[PDB]
Design a protein around this ligand. Structure first.
Ligand SMILES: [Mg+2]
Ligand SMILES: [Mg+2]
Ligand SMILES: [Mg+2]
Ligand SMILES: [Mg+2]
Ligand SMILES: [Mg+2]
Ligand SMILES: [Mg+2]
Ligand SMILES: [Mg+2]
Ligand SMILES: [Mg+2]
Ligand SMILES: [Mg+2]
Ligand SMILES: [Mg+2]
Ligand SMILES: [Mg+2]
Ligand SMILES: [Mg+2]
Ligand SMILES: [Mg+2]
Ligand SMILES: [Mg+2]
Ligand SMILES: [Mg+2]
Ligand SMILES: [Mg+2]
Ligand SMILES: [Mg+2]
Ligand SMILES: [Mg+2]
Ligand SMILES: [Mg+2]
Ligand SMILES: [Mg+2]
Ligand SMILES: [Mg+2]
Ligand SMILES: [Mg+2]
Ligand SMILES: [Mg+2]
Ligand SMILES: [Mg+2]
Ligand SMILES: [Mg+2]
Ligand SMILES: [Mg+2]
Ligand SMILES: [Mg+2]
Ligand SMILES: [Mg+2]
Ligand SMILES: [Mg+2]
Ligand SMILES: [Mg+2]
Ligand SMILES: [Mg+2]
Ligand SMILES: [Mg+2]
Ligand SMILES: [Mg+2]
Ligand SMILES: [Mg+2]
Ligand SMILES: [Mg+2]
Ligand SMILES: [Mg+2]
Ligand SMILES: [Mg+2]
Ligand SMILES: [Mg+2]
Ligand SMILES: [Mg+2]
Ligand SMILES: [Mg+2]
Ligand SMILES: [Mg+2]
Ligand SMILES: [Mg+2]
Ligand SMILES: [Mg+2]
Ligand SMILES: [Mg+2]
Ligand SMILES: [Mg+2]
Ligand SMILES: [Mg+2]
Ligand SMILES: [Mg+2]
Ligand SMILES: [Mg+2]
Ligand SMILES: [Mg+2]
Ligand SMILES: [Mg+2]
Ligand SMILES: [Mg+2]
Lengths: 271, 93, 46
RNA sequence: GAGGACCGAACCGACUAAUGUUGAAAAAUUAGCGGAUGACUUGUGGCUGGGGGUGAAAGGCCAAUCAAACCGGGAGAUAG
RNA sequence: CGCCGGAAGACCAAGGGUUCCUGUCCAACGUUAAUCGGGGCAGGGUGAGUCGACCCCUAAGGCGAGGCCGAAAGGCGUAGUCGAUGGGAAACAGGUUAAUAUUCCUGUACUUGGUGUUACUGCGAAGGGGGGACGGAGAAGGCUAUGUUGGCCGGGCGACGGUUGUCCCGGUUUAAGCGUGUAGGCUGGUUUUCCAGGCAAAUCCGGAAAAUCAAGGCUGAGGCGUGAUGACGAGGCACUACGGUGCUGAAGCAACAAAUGCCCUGCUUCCAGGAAAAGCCUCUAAGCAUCAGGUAACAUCAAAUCGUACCCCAAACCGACACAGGUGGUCAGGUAGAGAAUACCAAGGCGCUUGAGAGAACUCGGGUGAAGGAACUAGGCAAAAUGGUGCCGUAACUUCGGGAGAAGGCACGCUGAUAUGUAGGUGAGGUCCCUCGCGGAUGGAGCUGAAAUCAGUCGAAGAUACCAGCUGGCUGCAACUGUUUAUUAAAAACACAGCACUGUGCAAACACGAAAGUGGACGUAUACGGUGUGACGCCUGCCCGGUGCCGGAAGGUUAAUUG
């Protein structure tokens, strides 16, 4: 549910948080955890390659099954769990043979629901099938772009993809960005859409709430000196120039996609 | 065992001092200057062979040489190892 | 006030010690220059 | 029993005044002052290197050093 | 006599390195003298199976066989190998030195290995599983350290009125280990069958289905017993070479109070969702099956090496100084107090390495002040003032939380009574029950003990000292908390939650890289980057001529090339 906190403090006045009473209140499944060390946005040269990253709460990585290649074997949802590494929630499923895995929790899924992957699986939210076995027009998520590679599209909270057309060995998809893309039919997808759709309704409320998520402050380029940023200085507030990145590339309009390798799959660009 | 040629080199001198004397007449313990690289096993075997007494236990410590000043130049004395050798009750020297 | 030299023999040896100098070719040239000059103490040490 | 909540020591900071200014001190003392469960503070170790780093951005900081560190070299630069 | 006493005491780490102790010396060093010293000279001093390191294990990170990449130098990185600030076996009390002691001695323990014998015996890993193994906040229950009082024991009978008593002073200490499994926490237990999982195998883990039993198991402070007929012990008696040394040695209880320590790596709760690996337990594969190996008992052996002195708000460390500076962690007595504030003290440690006089101006740090009360001044700068607890009471405005401790006011000591000490807390004996114990119930002795009312009483004054908000009104700016010019600027500057635009379909954009690659991200458009704006409320009008960006592709122009 979406709840607004009462303004007992200036930092709590605008906080709007998302509560989910069905999330597991306990420790995650230990055999599916890994160390996830932070980077501060530094690469192997030790240089900051992505600004505004640093700090935040320590997080353990949950091994999520994005391939869903355990076909034929039914599985039941044990519980929904919070995952700090993504916006969506994850479900701990238990296969009939005793294996436990983590999957992205689709919308409407709850503890006790039964899911299955494979070409013979029923068409219902949570099941995974090759996209050539999925009816055209349906809404899917966790889509592969290469057969057997693992889902890469529509993984964020509340996202989904609809199959608009199928011909030959390819299907056409309408991504959440509004882009029409071709993907070969042997790629897999999970029925339904990703849960936790109200994730976008949350309001952090205070500056510290973003620091918990590992986001360092953003200094406006126009607030710097000319040596630091093209937006430079000036006596007072002066801009007088076209907006650019810190490295001089025109932002606010200039297209930067340059990939002739994958142009054949783009049916129509977003707009 | 330990070679006698090695045993004939680990013991250097009996340390003489007020603390060494009272340790001899109150705890039946002799104090010796031993080789810098001598172990408690070597010191025990050497005392039992050369002094022909029975040894209970050996305690060792390394003494750091003092930094003295000869006239106008500064020097430093060598470090040396000191051994507290405890004998059995009915033994003399 | 906190001055600039806060000693630590571990950091002193890891930054200027002998094995640190011998690690790279530039550090080995430092030792070469100091041997050529005739320094009594090549590196930091006890 | 929530809170970048309140009052207030340690702790961190540095708003005012006086003193000091060949100082007790190459930035402090004294009396007050701000924060004080947090975007907090601190220890140990590590990483980022000079047209480079880092910067809640003051051209700030990078060993009492900064609109381009230090050391050696070109080098006895050139100096109407 | 004075000062510190959450330190100016005690102890570690770091850092220093002989500054430690004794004898001796006083040139220089010491902001003076110096017989003294952290100074000179000589001698002495650091004792470990259990403390630390080393060692085993890994984090960030480093290095990196091959490898990939690069004019060369080199860069990155796999297998690996290093790397604590983290995980991993074991000792306590007393005594002793001029100087060391959890190291020596005394007493009483413990751990891990090796070898041996005996009894029993499926062992076996570079593999599987378990475990190790983990957040913040909050709550309050049980405890202890510790303290207070009583009792007990020893001593005392007071330089000046009183002091054989409801009087004074001192002591009333004892560990690890071993046994007991408590307050309390967690978890159903056992057996059988089966199974696409744990890369193979698995008796293990996971899953499925039965039957059966309901109490079983794990964890666990403290208490109690033992350790201990011991040690320690006020003191006394001896010698003193006058520092000390020797001998002897009483009581050694109870109640109450009580932690920020322990139970607690718990419990509850929240979102920002909270290391790794080994030791350890278990499982089998290859293999080995007489063996080997494992488990148990006893015996025996081993536990090396290095560190260990001394200093640590410091004259020994970082600051050129015996420098009002800086320096991580541990310990935490009494009275008052909410308190680790503050005042005065204990243990303990100090009087800060020039003094002696004098009692001018003036400067510094303070005290008091007639009448006036901001007339001062750029400006109430500075100073003065306010200051506690309880209760009463409290405006505009408001985002309904606030504003608010608004403002303002009253009470406040001591003695007695209520009540020879109350409400409350604690809880003995007794009694009863018990599936019997560290049990339950009842029971109330003793101990501790607010707050209030009434009456009385002293002073000019009872929150008496230290300690401890000035308040209100109008308005600019910034929503707020926060950040910043180390060393003249703390702000209206920066950030901020929120908003918008824009880029980005994942081998993402983008950034660092001659490259390999890495970050972005083990993320996937409810995501990420960039830019501007800056909570919230009401809003955000007109201009696409210029510049930029996006789209367009007909035409004009136009490079290498071609010749
Ligand atoms: Mg922003
Ligand atoms: Mg500026
Ligand atoms: Mg520029
Ligand atoms: Mg202007
Ligand atoms: Mg011994
Ligand atoms: Mg030793
Ligand atoms: Mg360094
Ligand atoms: Mg606060
Ligand atoms: Mg405060
Ligand atoms: Mg101050
Ligand atoms: Mg405040
Ligand atoms: Mg400027
Ligand atoms: Mg500087
Ligand atoms: Mg030249
Ligand atoms: Mg010249
Ligand atoms: Mg000396
Ligand atoms: Mg001395
Ligand atoms: Mg003198
Ligand atoms: Mg001396
Ligand atoms: Mg190589
Ligand atoms: Mg490498
Ligand atoms: Mg290692
Ligand atoms: Mg000592
Ligand atoms: Mg394991
Ligand atoms: Mg007690
Ligand atoms: Mg008298
Ligand atoms: Mg009298
Ligand atoms: Mg119990
Ligand atoms: Mg020692
Ligand atoms: Mg010591
Ligand atoms: Mg100390
Ligand atoms: Mg001190
Ligand atoms: Mg000092
Ligand atoms: Mg500090
Ligand atoms: Mg105090
Ligand atoms: Mg005077
Ligand atoms: Mg007056
Ligand atoms: Mg008057
Ligand atoms: Mg007046
Ligand atoms: Mg005036
Ligand atoms: Mg005037
Ligand atoms: Mg003032
Ligand atoms: Mg005042
Ligand atoms: Mg009255
Ligand atoms: Mg105005
Ligand atoms: Mg502000
Ligand atoms: Mg502020
Ligand atoms: Mg400044
Ligand atoms: Mg300032
Ligand atoms: Mg406009
Ligand atoms: Mg165009």
């Amino acid at each position: 549910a979406v709840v607004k906190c009462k303004p007992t403090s200036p930092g709590r006045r605008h906080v709007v948080k998302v509560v989910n009473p069905e999330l597991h209140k306990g420790k995650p499944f230990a055999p599916l955890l890994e160390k996830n060390s932070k980077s501060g946005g530094r690469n192997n040269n030790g240089r900051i390659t992505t600004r505004h990253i640093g700090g935040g709460h320590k997080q353990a990585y949950r091994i999520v099954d994005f391939k869903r290649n355990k076909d034929g074997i039914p599985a039941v949802v044990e519980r929904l769990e919070y995952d700090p590494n993504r916006s969506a929630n994850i479900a701990l499923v238990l296969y009939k043979d005793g294996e436990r895995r983590y999957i992205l929790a689709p919308k409407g899924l709850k503890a006790g629901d039964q899911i299955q992957s494979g070409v013979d699986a029923a068409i219902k939210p949570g099941n995974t099938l090759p996209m050539r076995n999925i009816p055209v027009g349906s809404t899917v998520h966790n889509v592969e772009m290469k057969p057997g590679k693992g889902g890469q599209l529509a993984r964020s909270a509340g996202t989904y993809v609809q199959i608009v057309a199928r011909d030959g060995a390819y299907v056409t998809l309408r991504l959440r960005s509004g882009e029409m893309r071709k993907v070969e039919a042997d790629c897999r997808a999970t029925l339904g859409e990703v849960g936790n759709a109200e994730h976008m309704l949350r309001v952090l409320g205070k500056a510290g709430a973003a620091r918990w998520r590992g986001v360092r402050p953003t200094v406006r380029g126009t607030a710097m000196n000319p040596v630091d940023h093209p937006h430079g200085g000036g006596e007072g507030r002066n801009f007088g120039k076209h907006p650019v990145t810190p490295w001089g590339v025109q932002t606010k309009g200039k297209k930067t996609r340059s990939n002739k390798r994958t142009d054949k799959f783009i049916v129509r660009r977003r707009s | 065992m330990i070679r006698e040629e090695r045993l004939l080199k680990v013991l250097r001198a009996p340390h003489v001092s007020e603390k060494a004397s009272t340790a001899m007449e109150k705890s039946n313990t002799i104090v010796l200057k031993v080789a810098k690289d001598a172990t408690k096993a070597e010191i025990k075997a050497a005392v039992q062979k050369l002094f022909e007494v029975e040894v209970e236990v050996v305690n060792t410590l390394v003494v750091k040489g003092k930094v003295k000043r000869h006239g106008q130049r500064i020097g430093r004395r060598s470090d040396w190892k000191k051994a507290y050798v405890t004998l059995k009750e009915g033994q003399n020297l | 006030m906190k001055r600039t030299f806060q000693p630590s023999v571990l950091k002193r040896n890891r930054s200027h010690g002998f094995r640190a100098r011998m690690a790279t070719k530039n550090g080995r040239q430092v030792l070469a220059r100091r041997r050529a000059k005739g320094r009594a103490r090549l590196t930091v040490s006890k």
